[PDB]
Symmetry: D2
Subunit: 116 residues, 4 copies
């Protein structure tokens, strides 16, 4: 299985958010953010294949979603620079994580679905 997936929806058009840039970081032993994985959502607004179970070890992760470039190419000037989701992962063994974000120019919501 694929342990980390990202799903993005547009709440203005009622559609997947397509071609949204995503960057994932893991908190360093030295207290800082190391690049972990990056990608772009597809035509269904999903991003698969960021990591593997082997490489996705315990840690603190930050999933940064580049909402402002997205809204920009649609002629919108949004409030947020981006949407960042920060969470501890795999601290009681391996899990599968989907991080969904719902986007509006001045609002966004994010929910995590974690299965075992």
């Amino acid at each position: 299985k694929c342990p980390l997936m990202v799903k993005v929806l547009d709440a203005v058009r009622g559609s997947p958010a397509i071609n949204v840039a995503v960057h994932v970081f893991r908190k360093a032993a030295d207290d800082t953010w190391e690049p972990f994985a990056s990608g772009k959502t597809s035509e269904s607004g999903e991003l698969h294949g960021l990591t593997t179970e082997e490489e996705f070890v315990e840690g603190i992760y930050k999933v940064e979603i580049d909402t402002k470039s997205y809204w920009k190419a649609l002629g919108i000037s949004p409030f947020h620079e981006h949407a960042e989701v920060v969470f501890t992962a795999n601290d009681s063994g391996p899990r599968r994580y989907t991080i969904a974000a719902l986007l509006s120019p001045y609002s966004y919501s994010t929910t995590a679905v974690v299965t075992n």
Copy 2:
């Protein structure tokens, strides 16, 4: 003010102004009687709907006319309206807040 309504616009980051709101009480025959109504003010709020005397235990529906709000802004919406249905009992002050987007809304109750 036992019952207040607060509407926001997630496209523009602003109160949602002049939104028609209709409130209904469920009658014993299972249908909705009009109870209160109004339009949101400049701060997206609607106060003075009921009084403590009249706001007795029961099932109330609050209906927010979101489709007109979007239509007047030139934006095409998904929902006919947004409806919030709950039971008021005595075991407070109720704020019903709604956050609007054309294809998405949320609603939260703040009970204090």
Copy 3:
């Protein structure tokens, strides 16, 4: 394809909302709500097979999600009686509709994803 699907998530547990009752109605020519379809979300919190393209004609629909029974069997007394989503469908030809609801005891959110 399957023209109307419902997806329900629990925002307290970060999981699909399983065994959630859903009732769909269509607005009558005589101004009232006729029963159109009903079902229960599965282990992924999805409900498929409510209708067919042939039977899913233009109209106004109401998708009622029985949030209070759900929260009740988990020992929670929620605010809402249910979550109802009301929308015009297929008014410019057939579409596919997913109605997602996100649920918390005093809050819920619903978004529609409409594709063609």
Copy 4:
């Protein structure tokens, strides 16, 4: 009050009380300088963070300590915290509102 914070609890339908909030300004070297902080009051609100003089154009991050809030209630949360990152420019009053659930939060900006 150029910048205000409003936190709500979606599990209990109540303001989120005594939530630590830290605000940062981005420094020219690309790092976050502490700027303002406080705890939400009984009505889930935090006022008096800055003044108009000090709140100049720039990128600000607001960080809401949601994990402590849930931990103190005996409920296990998903996020380390909730962060809102935006640019303040002069082309207002900013309310940053956050609606919290253990595995889900939303944030909306009301700019008037």
